[PDB]
Amino acid sequence: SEKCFEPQLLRFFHKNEIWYRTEQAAVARCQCKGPDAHCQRLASQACRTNPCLHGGRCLEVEGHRLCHCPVGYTGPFCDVDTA
Numbered sequence: 586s587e588k589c590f591e592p593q594l595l596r597f598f599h600k601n602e603i604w605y606r607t608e609q610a611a612v613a614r615c616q617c618k619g620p621d622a623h624c625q626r627l628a629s630q631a632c633r634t635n636p637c638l639h640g641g642r643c644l645e646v647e648g649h650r651l652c653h654c655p656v657g658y659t660g661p662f663c664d665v666d667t668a
Contacts, residue, residue: 589617593659598622605646607653612646638663 588597593606598617606613606624615624629651632643637652641663644651654663 587619589615589620589622591615591622595659605651607642607644607651609642609653610644612644612651614646636662 586600588599589602590597591604591606594604596604598604600617600619603614603616606615606622608626611627611629613624613626615622627646629644629646632645632650635641635643636650637643637654639658640655641652641658644653652661652663654660657667659665659667
């Protein structure tokens with residue numbers, strides 16, 4: 586019943602929970618086994634409009650827009666300062 590830690594989200598997930606993890610290109614969908622996650626890399630597309638701040642790359646999967654943030658920023662839109 587160990588949980589899985591996702592550093593991109595600073596969040597622990599329970600067994601069977603599912604979340605997205607970004608790379609520069611592209612996105613992966615992860616499910617917690619505990620403590621390890623099993624992830625599947627998905628083909629994503631670029632968002633037409635980019636809501637990501639500070640150089641974030643916007644990746645679209647399930648029509649849903651994710652931001653791959655640069656160092657110094659995090660959050661849904663690279664809007665949370667890490668410093």
